């Protein structure tokens, strides 16, 4: 559906804000090395955060 | 009987060494504290969902 907000650039390796399709938060975006299975989007932990 | 007492003490120290160098789990009273603290922290983390 994707409600109308303009997209911006992707900045990595420093403490920034982010918004991925409504998933608001604050943290460091480092690139990963663990491939998903190609039907999955999220990821969770013990406290059920992304 | 000094030499006999010396050999008995050395044999007892060696048997303590053997019962620790085997896989006899003897430090259960110390492992219980670590287990209970880790379990309390895990429950406190799982209460956030």
UniProtKB/Swiss-Prot annotation, chain A:
| Stated name of the protein | Spike protein S1
Q: What is the effect of changing residue 47 to D?
A: In strain: Alpha/B.1.1.7
Function of the protein: Attaches the virion to the cell membrane by interacting with host receptor, initiating the infection. The major receptor is host ACE2. When S2/S2' has been cleaved, binding to the receptor triggers direct fusion at the cell membrane. When S2/S2' has not been cleaved, binding to the receptor results in internalization of the virus by endocytosis using host TFRC and GRM2 and leading to fusion of the virion membrane with the host endosomal membrane. Alternatively, may use NRP1/NRP2 and integrin as entry receptors.
Q: How does it assemble?
A: Binds to host ACE2. RBD also interacts with the N-linked glycan on 'Asn-90' of ACE2. Cleavage of S generates a polybasic C-terminal sequence on S1 that binds to host Neuropilin-1 (NRP1) and Neuropilin-2 (NRP2) receptors. Interacts with host integrin alpha-5/beta-1 (ITGA5:ITGB1) and with ACE2 in complex with integrin alpha-5/beta-1 (ITGA5:ITGB1). May interact via cytoplasmic c-terminus with M protein. May interact (via N-terminus) with host bilirubin and biliverdin, thereby preventing antibody binding to the SARS-CoV-2 spike NTD via an allosteric mechanism.
Q: Where is this region: Disordered?
A: 1-18
Curated annotation (Swiss-Prot), chain B:
Where does the record place the region Heptad repeat 1? Answer: 2-49
According to the lineage, what is the superkingdom? Viruses
UniProt-reported outcome of changing residue 32 to N: In strain: Delta/B.1.617.2, Mu/B.1.621
Function, in words: Subunit of the fusion protein that is processed upon entry into the host cell. Mediates fusion of the virion and cellular membranes by functioning as a class I viral fusion protein. Contains a viral fusion peptide that is unmasked after S2 cleavage. This cleavage can occur at the cell membrane by host TMPRSS2 or during endocytosis by host CSTL. In either case, this triggers an extensive and irreversible conformational change that leads to fusion of the viral envelope with the cellular cytoplasmic membrane, releasing viral genomic RNA into the host cell cytoplasm.
Protein name (Swiss-Prot/TrEMBL): Spike protein S2'
What organism, scientifically named, is this protein from? Severe acute respiratory syndrome coronavirus 2
Taxonomic path: Viruses, Riboviria, Orthornavirae, Pisuviricota, Pisoniviricetes
Q: What gene codes for this chain?
A: S
Which part of the full protein is shown? Answer: 919 to 967 of 1273
């Amino acid at each position: 559906v994707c409600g109308p907000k303009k997209s911006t650039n992707l900045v990595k390796n420093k403490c920034v804000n982010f918004n991925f399709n409504g998933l608001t938060g604050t943290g460091v975006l480092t690139e990963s090395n663990k491939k998903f299975l190609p039907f999955q989007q999220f990821g969770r932990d013990i406290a059920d955060t992304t | 009987n000094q030499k006999l007492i010396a050999n008995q003490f050395n044999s007892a120290i060696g048997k303590i060494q053997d019962s620790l160098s085997s896989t006899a789990s003897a430090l259960g009273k110390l492992q219980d504290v670590v287990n209970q603290n880790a379990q309390a922290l895990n429950t406190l983390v799982k209460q956030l969902s």
